[PDB]
mmCIF file of C-alpha atoms in Angstrom:
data_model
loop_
_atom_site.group_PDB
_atom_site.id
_atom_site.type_symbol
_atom_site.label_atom_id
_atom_site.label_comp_id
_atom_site.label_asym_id
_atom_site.label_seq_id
_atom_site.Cartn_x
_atom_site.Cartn_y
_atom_site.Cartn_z
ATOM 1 C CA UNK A 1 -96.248 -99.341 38.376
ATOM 2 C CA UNK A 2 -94.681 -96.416 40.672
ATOM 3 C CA UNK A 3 -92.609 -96.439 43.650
ATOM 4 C CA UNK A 4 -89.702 -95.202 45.538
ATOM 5 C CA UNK A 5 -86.578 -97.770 44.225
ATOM 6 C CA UNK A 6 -83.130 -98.118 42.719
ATOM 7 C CA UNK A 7 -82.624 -95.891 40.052
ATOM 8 C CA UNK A 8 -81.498 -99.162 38.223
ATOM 9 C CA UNK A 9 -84.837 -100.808 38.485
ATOM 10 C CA UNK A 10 -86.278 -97.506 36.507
ATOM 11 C CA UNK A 11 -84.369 -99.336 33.393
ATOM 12 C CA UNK A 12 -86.642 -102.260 33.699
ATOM 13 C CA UNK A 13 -89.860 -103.312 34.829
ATOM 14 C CA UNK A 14 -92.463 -104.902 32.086
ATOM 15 C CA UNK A 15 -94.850 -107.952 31.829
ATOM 16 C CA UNK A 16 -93.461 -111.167 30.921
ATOM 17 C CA UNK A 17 -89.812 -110.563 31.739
ATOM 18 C CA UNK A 18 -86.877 -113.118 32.648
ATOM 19 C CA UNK A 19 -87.247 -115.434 35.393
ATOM 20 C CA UNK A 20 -90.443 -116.767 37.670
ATOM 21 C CA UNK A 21 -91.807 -113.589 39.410
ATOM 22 C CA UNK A 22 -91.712 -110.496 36.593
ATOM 23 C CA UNK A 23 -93.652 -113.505 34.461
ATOM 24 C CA UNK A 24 -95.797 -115.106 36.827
ATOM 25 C CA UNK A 25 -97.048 -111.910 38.847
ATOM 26 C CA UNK A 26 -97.198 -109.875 35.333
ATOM 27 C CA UNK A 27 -98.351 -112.404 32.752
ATOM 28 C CA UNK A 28 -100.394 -110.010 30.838
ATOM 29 C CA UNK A 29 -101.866 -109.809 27.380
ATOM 30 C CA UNK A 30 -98.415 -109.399 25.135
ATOM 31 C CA UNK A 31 -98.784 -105.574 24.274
ATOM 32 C CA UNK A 32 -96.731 -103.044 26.146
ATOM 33 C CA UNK A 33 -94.897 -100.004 25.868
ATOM 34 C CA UNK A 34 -92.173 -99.571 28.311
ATOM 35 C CA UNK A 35 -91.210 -96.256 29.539
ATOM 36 C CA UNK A 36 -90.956 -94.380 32.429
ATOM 37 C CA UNK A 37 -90.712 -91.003 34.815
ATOM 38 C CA UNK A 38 -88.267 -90.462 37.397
ATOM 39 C CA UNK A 39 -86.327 -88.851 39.046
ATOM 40 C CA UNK A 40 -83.806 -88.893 42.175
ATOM 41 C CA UNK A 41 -84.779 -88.623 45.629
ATOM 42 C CA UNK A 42 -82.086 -89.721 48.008
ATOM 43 C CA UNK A 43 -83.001 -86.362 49.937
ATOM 44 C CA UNK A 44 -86.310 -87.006 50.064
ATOM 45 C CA UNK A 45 -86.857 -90.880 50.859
ATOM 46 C CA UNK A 46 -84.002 -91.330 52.454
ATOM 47 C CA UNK A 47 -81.699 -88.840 54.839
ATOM 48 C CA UNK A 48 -81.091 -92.958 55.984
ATOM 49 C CA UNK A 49 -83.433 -95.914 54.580
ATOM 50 C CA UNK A 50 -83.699 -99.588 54.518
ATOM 51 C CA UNK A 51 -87.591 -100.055 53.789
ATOM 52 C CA UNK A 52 -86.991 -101.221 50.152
ATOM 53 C CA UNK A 53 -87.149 -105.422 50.458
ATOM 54 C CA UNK A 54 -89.470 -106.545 48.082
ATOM 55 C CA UNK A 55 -91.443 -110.007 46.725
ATOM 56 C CA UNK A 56 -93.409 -124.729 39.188
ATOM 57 C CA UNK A 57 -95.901 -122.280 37.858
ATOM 58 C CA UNK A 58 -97.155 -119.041 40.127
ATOM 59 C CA UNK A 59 -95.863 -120.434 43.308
ATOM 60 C CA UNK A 60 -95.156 -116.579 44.439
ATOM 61 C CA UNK A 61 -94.431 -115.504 48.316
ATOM 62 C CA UNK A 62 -95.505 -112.380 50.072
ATOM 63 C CA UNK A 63 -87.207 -112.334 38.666
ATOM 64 C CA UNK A 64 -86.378 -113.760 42.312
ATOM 65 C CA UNK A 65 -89.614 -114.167 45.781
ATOM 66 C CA UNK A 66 -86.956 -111.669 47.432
ATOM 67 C CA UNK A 67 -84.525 -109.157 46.626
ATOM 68 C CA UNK A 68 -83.885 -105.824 49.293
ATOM 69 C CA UNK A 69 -82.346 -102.115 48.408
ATOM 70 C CA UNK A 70 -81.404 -99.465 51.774
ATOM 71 C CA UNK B 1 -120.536 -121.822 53.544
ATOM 72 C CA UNK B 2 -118.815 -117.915 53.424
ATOM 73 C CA UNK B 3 -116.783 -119.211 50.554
ATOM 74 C CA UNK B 4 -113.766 -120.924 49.124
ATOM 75 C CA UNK B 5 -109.831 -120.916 49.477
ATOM 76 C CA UNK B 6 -107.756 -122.651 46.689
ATOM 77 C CA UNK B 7 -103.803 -122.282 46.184
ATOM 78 C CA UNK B 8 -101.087 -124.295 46.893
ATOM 79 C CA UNK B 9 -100.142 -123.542 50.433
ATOM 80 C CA UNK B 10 -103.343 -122.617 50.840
ATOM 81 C CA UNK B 11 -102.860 -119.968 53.966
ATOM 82 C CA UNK B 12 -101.445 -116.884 52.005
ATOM 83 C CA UNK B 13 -97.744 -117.573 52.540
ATOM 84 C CA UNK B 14 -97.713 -118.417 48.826
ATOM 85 C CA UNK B 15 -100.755 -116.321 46.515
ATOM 86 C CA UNK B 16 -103.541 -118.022 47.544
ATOM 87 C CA UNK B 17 -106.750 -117.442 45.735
ATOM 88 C CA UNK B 18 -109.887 -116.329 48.848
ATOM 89 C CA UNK B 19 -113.545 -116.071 47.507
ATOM 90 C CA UNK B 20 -116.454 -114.638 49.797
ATOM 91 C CA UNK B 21 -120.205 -114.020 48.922
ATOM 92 C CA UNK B 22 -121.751 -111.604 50.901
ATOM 93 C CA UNK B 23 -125.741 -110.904 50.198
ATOM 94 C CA UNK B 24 -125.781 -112.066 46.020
ATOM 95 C CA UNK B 25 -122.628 -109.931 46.070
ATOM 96 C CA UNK B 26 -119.046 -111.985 45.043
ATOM 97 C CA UNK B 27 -115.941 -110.559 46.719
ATOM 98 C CA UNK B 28 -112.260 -111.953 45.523
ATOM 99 C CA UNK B 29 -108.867 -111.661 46.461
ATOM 100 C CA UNK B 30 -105.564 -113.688 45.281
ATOM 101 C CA UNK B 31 -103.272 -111.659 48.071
ATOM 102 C CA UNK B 32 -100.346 -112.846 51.019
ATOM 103 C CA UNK B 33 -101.731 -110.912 53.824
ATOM 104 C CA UNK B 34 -103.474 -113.075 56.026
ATOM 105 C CA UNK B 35 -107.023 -113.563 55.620
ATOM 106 C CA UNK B 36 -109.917 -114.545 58.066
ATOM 107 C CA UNK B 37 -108.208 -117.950 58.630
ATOM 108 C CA UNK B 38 -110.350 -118.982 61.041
ATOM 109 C CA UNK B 39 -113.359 -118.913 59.097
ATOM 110 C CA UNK B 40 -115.808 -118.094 62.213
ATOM 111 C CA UNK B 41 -119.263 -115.885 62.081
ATOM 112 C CA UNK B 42 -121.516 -116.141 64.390
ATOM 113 C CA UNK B 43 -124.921 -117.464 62.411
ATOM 114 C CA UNK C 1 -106.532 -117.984 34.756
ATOM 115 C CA UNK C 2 -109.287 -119.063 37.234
ATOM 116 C CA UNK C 3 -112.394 -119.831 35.130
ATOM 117 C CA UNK C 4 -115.482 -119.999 37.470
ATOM 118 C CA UNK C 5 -119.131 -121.726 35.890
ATOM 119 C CA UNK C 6 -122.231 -121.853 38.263
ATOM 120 C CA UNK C 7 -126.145 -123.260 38.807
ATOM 121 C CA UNK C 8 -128.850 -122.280 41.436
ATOM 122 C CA UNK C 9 -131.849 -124.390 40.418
ATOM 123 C CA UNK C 10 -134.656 -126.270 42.152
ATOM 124 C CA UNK C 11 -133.853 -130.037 44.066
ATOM 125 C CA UNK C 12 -136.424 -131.186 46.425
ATOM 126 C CA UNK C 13 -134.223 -134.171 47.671
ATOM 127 C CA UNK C 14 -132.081 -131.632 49.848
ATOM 128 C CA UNK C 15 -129.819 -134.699 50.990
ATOM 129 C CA UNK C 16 -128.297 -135.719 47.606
ATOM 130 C CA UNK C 17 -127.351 -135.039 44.333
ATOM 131 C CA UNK C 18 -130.593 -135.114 41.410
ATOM 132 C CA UNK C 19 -131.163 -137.188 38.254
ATOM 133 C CA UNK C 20 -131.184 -135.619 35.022
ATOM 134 C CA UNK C 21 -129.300 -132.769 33.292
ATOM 135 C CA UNK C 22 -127.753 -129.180 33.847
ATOM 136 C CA UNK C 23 -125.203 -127.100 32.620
ATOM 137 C CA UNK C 24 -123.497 -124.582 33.578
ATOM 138 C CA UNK C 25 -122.596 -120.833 32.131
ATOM 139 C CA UNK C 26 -119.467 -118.993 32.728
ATOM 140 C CA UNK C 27 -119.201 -116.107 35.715
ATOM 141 C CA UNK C 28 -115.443 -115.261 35.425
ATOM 142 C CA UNK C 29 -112.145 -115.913 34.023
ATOM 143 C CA UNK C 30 -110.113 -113.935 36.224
ATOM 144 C CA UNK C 31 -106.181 -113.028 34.786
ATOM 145 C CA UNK C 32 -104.884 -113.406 38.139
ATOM 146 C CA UNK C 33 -101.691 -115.829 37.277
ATOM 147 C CA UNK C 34 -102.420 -118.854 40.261
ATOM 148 C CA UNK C 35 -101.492 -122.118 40.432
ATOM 149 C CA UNK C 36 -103.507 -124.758 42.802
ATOM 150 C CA UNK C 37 -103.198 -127.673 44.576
ATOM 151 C CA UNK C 38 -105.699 -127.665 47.447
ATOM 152 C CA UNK C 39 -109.164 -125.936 48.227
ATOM 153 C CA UNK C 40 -111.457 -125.340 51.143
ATOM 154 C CA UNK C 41 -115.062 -124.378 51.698
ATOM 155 C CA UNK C 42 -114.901 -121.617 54.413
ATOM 156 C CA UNK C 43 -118.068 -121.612 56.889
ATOM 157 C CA UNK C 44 -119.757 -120.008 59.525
ATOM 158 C CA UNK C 45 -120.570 -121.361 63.002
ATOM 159 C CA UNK C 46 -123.461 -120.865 65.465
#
């Protein structure tokens, strides 16, 4: 579960969560232990970047289908 | 017969489920890039 | 979770569906979080 992202999304992402995507995409077996590593990088993956949009039961496309970060 | 879609949409717009057999091998994939949507191989 | 149950076995009357009894074990049950609708057989063409 790594990427390049908001450094508020670092606070988040687990299986199960609020809303129709983070449960339908991620509806794992109920253990978990959420924690992360990170750290910032907007001298590395950025300058200068807008490459950071990202995607009834399961009905998913390509919380929320679409959300974007730049 | 390669194999099977199922989904809703059914064309990988929304997750749509693709199943191939190749040989007795089983190949699978849920995923939004598109697929081989025309079916075709040349028997 | 798609659940997926399967047969090969031996019908002479290649045009239509046999008499008589068979069932079917498990293959999969895959945790992939789908929902369904619609399905189609994909095929190859000469």
């Amino acid at each position: 579960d790594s990427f390049v992202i908001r450094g508020d999304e670092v606070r988040q992402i687990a299986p199960g969560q609020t809303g129709k995507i983070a449960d339908y995409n991620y509806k794992l077996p109920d253990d978990f232990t959420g924690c992360v590593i990170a750290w910032n990088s907007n001298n590395l993956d950025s300058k200068g970047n807008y490459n950071y949009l990202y995607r009834k039961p399961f009905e998913r496309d390509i919380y929320f289908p679409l959300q974007s970060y730049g | 017969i390669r194999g099977w879609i199922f989904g809703t949409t059914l064309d990988s717009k929304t997750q749509s489920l693709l199943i191939v057999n190749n040989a007795t091998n089983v190949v699978i994939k849920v995923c939004e890039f598109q697929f081989c949507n025309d079916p075709f191989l040349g028997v | 979770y798609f659940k997926i149950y399967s047969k090969h076995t031996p019908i002479n009357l290649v045009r239509d569906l046999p008499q008589g009894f068979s069932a079917l074990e498990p293959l999969v049950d895959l945790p992939i979080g789908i929902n369904i609708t619609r399905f189609q057989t994909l095929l190859a063409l000469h």
